[PDB]
Symmetry: C3
Subunit: 314 residues, 3 copies
């Protein structure tokens, strides 16, 4: 199977500049090269260039709506394209607002996909519930069918079509949810495993359940949207919204190895890696290295080791 | 329900000055205010002023016996008082010797209470077994019925009445126990989950059993005495007796969320937070922040999120 | 029962000098003295003096073959000797190549022994599969019966006799395995718990099964070979091959406490502690302290506490 890396150096989804440097930092670590060493074929599509919408006035509270909507429309296009050719899309972010485009484009080709959202945040605020206008805190609101018409249309997102329902998504690692967001996920009956469920069950049982929940009936394409702040600030410090008590490096890796084992990984997002937020060069190195480690993991790298088939090492 | 904060700026229970500053430093973090944001009514009783007993000679090995027994007699009074009014007591300390007063006063009103002691220590040394005269290594000895008469009466503690038996207490997080203390907990058949049991079972199963053990037959008021050193020095460094290999921030929070879910929390102690023992300001900030986080947790704050009832966020 | 400490200040098994200082550093921490405080009788055999083989040319890729084979022949002798006298052998290393001698000698006296290998590496590369000629990446190859004749004889190891088969060994903590090694352990059906299995099962269940696997049928002497890099670099940084995502101090201690409880510990190895690789003195202190802590644990130190029998502390 093929892999196509797509860089999304975008940061208008939030107020801290830096996330646009995420792709550069990930490639600089040898991500693409390290991927070619796996059993997959890799093609690097390079970084999309996002056209900045001049005079992007704030829609009520929402900041940079048009710039965000446009960059996402463009990304959804690219993704739909590579997904059309039967290749696996890997978006390297900027901020989590690019999940809108990433998942939209993917759904066009695989309408029956399910989404595994690894984050410390639900990112489901609607333009009416956000305390800040930041759109990287709203990605899921624009994608849920059940949320259609529950908030005013936003300048630049008219092209978006709610592709997935509350029954197709599972959250893992929640630990920082707004009152609004909590109301929403409780009301819509969305399946989630907050850090408290992970503590109670263990990452093992958590994955076993999300799989029987999303794939119990029909086997379908899996879209993994991974926010790096889903792991504890001790593993991924260089992010815009670090929340203490998060997933461990081991847990993160366990998640990615299980998803690889399902053979259903179709799309992947590596978001929120911000190089400029590291307090020491080492903190940036730590964050990038584990981001790379989680990606290689999605594509076969196991902790028990790997050996090329048909080669007799003796 | 009502919550009443009682500050216990006392430190004679041990040799390191600093713990008196715990209260000051927990309020400074915004705790009281943060508590008012929960579904509880909060009243801050302020900090008790402890009268220093002049010429407090050491009883054999035991240091500052009268001063300690005195500040405890006074605390037990205050606690018994608020407990009588049907409010939940939250003592913010100084050292763990104040658990004597805290639990004594609580028991006067709710004689059938059980105690969940989160510490890395058993704090059950008798005046005859301590290697140091330090009284905050002896709280539980003065409270156990089964230990009555097994040690000399102590100047200042004649007012204390063993209110609980070995069947009403459960230890969680032990990892630094003296030979003497080990003998005692083994001989009296006290239920405990050392770090080794936590490793083996997982915090989930640990809580499940502590509940079926203490509440299996009769549902009773729960008194949670939490020594901040119960968590690993990486989360709560600013304490007088840090022991490596302790509970994690996640596990500490899991404990408190489960106790909140029982609806039986009656009394709470947040002890041993010493601001002067932080090697860097950040270490004090870390310690205080997680102390506050554990308190809010006891009173409702969940990691999956919270939303006010009856408010339609859509 | 008796304990005999044997120092193995050897480092030719790998390229980084420093591991020879491991014993000196473990004793300096008070290891021997702290051991005497346990219910065991301790005799310190001192450090073996290894004769350096001049003109030690590299057998193909393998470096220092004769020096390594000679130091191991000598070690196996010393170990066979103390094992014969019915005492428990504890080897303090240098590098992990000394496990060849350590286990060989042990097997001579207890041919039915099983080996519990705690490492992040399988250390099972054959002289034909190593990318580097380093012999401390090959210990297990020289000890497996199933690997006999699968690689050329090596200058200096003609005295070695494959003593254990693939069904007598269990790996715990693997996370850095070469393609070659992976092929081997998969082909020979060796039982192992990589970090992913530990994540899924929990150290508790992991130990439960390793015991039913190795001791289900016959109870036999246990040889624990512990590579300090088996724990996360955050607990044991001072090693030559740190790999992120390892066992936690708690998990390491759980392992040793369970092995103590079986009453079958016959042989023990504390390897790879390199004092010169610490970035700050504290990192060396951290490493040594936890090495000592795991050793004391093997011989009775429990986290719940310990009290001498027959002494009434009241
Ligand atoms: Mn996000
Ligand atoms: Mn996030
Ligand atoms: Mn205490
Ligand atoms: Mn304590
Ligand atoms: Mn090794
Ligand atoms: Mn190793």
């Amino acid at each position: 199977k093929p892999i196509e890396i797509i860089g999304a150096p975008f940061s208008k989804g939030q107020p801290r500049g830096g996330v646009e440097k995420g792709p550069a930092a990930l490639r600089k670590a040898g991500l693409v090269e390290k991927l070619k060493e796996t059993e997959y074929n890799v093609r690097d599509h390079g970084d999309l260039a996002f056209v900045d919408v001049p005079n992007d006035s704030p829609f009520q509270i929402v900041k940079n709506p048009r710039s965000v909507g446009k960059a996402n429309e463009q990304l959804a296009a690219v993704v739909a394209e590579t997904q059309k050719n039967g290749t696996i899309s890997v978006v390297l972010g900027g901020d989590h607002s690019m999940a809108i485009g990433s998942i939209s484009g993917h759904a066009r080709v695989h309408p029956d996909l399910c989404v595994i959202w690894v984050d410390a945040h639900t990112d489901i605020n609607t333009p009416l519930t956000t305390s800040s206008g930041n759109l990287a805190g709203q990605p899921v609101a624009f994608l849920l069918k059940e949320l259609k018409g529950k908030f005013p249309d936003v300048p630049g997102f008219s092209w978006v079509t709610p592709c997935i329902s509350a029954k197709d998504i599972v959250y893992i690692g929640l630990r920082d949810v707004d009152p609004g967001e909590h109301y929403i996920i409780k009301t819509l009956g969305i399946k989630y495993f907050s850090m408290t469920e992970v503590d109670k069950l263990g990452i093992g049982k958590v994955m076993e359940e999300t799989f029987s929940y999303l794939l119990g009936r029909k086997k379908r394409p899996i879209h993994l949207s991974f926010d790096v702040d889903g792991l504890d600030p001790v593993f991924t410090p260089a992010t815009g919204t670090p929340v203490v008590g998060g997933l461990s490096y081991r847990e993160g890796l366990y998640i990615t190895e299980e998803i690889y084992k399902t053979g259903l990984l179709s799309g992947l997002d590596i978001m929120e890696v911000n190089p400029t937020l590291g307090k020491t060069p080492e903190e940036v190195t730590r964050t990038v290295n584990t981001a790379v480690a989680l990606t290689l993991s999605c594509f076969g790298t196991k902790r028990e080791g790997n050996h090329k088939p048909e080669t007799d090492y003796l």
